[PDB]
């Protein structure tokens, strides 16, 4: 039962790509299994938090899963969190409104002569 | 429960480097490890990130400041002089 194991590939060094975990086989043996690295969650493009509703994969793996699993149904679906989308809409409206009043005030109250 | 008479934070240096040098470094260590109240949000969460960078844990703003204090007297005086120079002449 307390049996020792060996690597199954030619690399003998403990690098950030030589990742293994122990298994037990239906033949009653302790072996080693070589595993990849963990995925990373995409981040928001304004505040930098983890976006909800999107899986964490290695970059090449996103090329095979379907489109609705990689986005949420809203403007700026990926890459923005929703709190940031709320700020953009309000800020865009308020600044645009002040632009009109500043123009009208400047034209009327100062170019009446 | 005071557990130290005078050395304070510079008790990690044991009996090394001389008494005068430990006092001088103590003056700068106390002020660089303290917390300061944010100017933008008001909470008491502002710590030093790097030698001239200070960041707020709450509202996520970072600011350029002194080496071991958030502001320097020379910078504070200049801001008033600049304010007075521009204002009382142009306004």
């Amino acid at each position: 039962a307390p049996t020792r194991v060996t690597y199954r590939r030619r690399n003998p060094y403990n690098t950030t790509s030589n990742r293994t975990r122990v298994i037990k086989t239906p033949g009653g043996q302790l072996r080693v299994l070589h595993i990849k690295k963990r995925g990373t969650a995409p981040k928001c493009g304004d505040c930098g938090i983890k976006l909800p509703g999107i899986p964490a994969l290695r970059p090449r793996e996103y090329a095979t899963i379907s489109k609705p699993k990689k986005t949420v149904q809203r403007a700026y679906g990926g890459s923005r969190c929703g709190n940031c989308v709320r700020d953009r809409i309000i800020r865009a409206f308020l600044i645009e409104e002040q632009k009109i009043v500043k123009k009208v005030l400047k034209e009327q109250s100062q170019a009446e002569k | 429960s005071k557990r130290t008479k005078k050395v304070g934070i510079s008790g990690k240096y044991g009996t090394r480097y001389g008494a005068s040098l430990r006092k001088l470094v103590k003056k700068q260590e106390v002020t660089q490890h303290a917390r300061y109240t944010c100017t933008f949000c008001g909470k008491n969460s502002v710590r030093r990130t790097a030698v001239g960078i200070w960041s707020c844990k709450s509202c996520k703003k970072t600011m350029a400041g002194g080496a071991y204090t958030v502001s320097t007297p020379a910078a504070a005086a200049m801001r008033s002089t600049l304010r007075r120079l521009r204002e009382i002449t142009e306004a």
């Binding site: - | 001239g52 350029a64 002194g66 080496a67 320097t72 801001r79």
Partner: protein, 202 residues
């Protein structure tokens, strides 16, 4: 690394193309993320703005001052330092400035500068106190630490050479017009010894 004086990342917009450009300035004390800054002849007298010296009044303090208009900054770019505007000369277009070393200089008025003082404060106030601390400082700059004394080498190595006692043996002030391999010591020294009074030169 290797520098005091934190840096600032600023994003502008292109007047002729649909894109944006990112620059890297030196940070003045008081600047923060999310702040608008302005550059040009008609900019305002606020910390962090960049404008020609012809648009500032006497006594203002700036940093990263161009020696000539267009070279993008040469003077006063180190932590806790600045230059001072002294006077103008509008008919010919020159400005007098004062430098951190204490010297005076004359510069064309179209040179640009940034209002304020360079962030980084009084870095040199606390002792390093440990050999390892000085080692970490230079390990990211150059291979210059530690340093052996010339008086402790053999004559084949250094002019201060050998002898049955450690000593120099001749005057340590060396002429300005000497040969490479002879300049070791105090080069072209006007005087020597402990400075008692005030220094007349300004």
């Amino acid at each position: 690394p290797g520098r005091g004086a934190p840096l600032a990342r600023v994003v502008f917009r292109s007047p002729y193309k649909y894109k944006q450009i990112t620059e890297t300035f030196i940070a003045n004390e008081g600047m923060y993320t999310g702040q608008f800054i302005y550059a040009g002849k008609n900019a305002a007298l606020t910390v962090g703005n960049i404008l020609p010296l012809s648009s500032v009044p006497e006594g203002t303090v700036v940093s990263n001052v161009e020696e000539k208009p267009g070279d993008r900054g040469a003077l006063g770019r180190t932590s806790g330092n600045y230059v001072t505007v002294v006077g103008h000369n509008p008919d010919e277009g020159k400005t007098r400035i004062k430098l951190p070393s204490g010297a005076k200089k004359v510069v064309p008025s179209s040179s640009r500068g940034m209002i304020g003082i360079v962030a980084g404060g009084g870095r040199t106030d606390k002792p390093l106190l440990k050999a390892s601390r000085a080692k970490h400082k230079f390990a990211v700059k150059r291979n210059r630490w530690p340093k052996t004394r010339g008086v402790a080498m053999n004559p084949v190595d250094h002019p201060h050479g050998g002898g049955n006692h450690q000593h120099i043996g001749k005057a340590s002030t060396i002429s300005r017009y000497a040969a490479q391999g002879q300049k070791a010591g105090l080069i072209a020294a006007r005087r020597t010894g402990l400075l008692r009074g005030t220094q007349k030169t300004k």
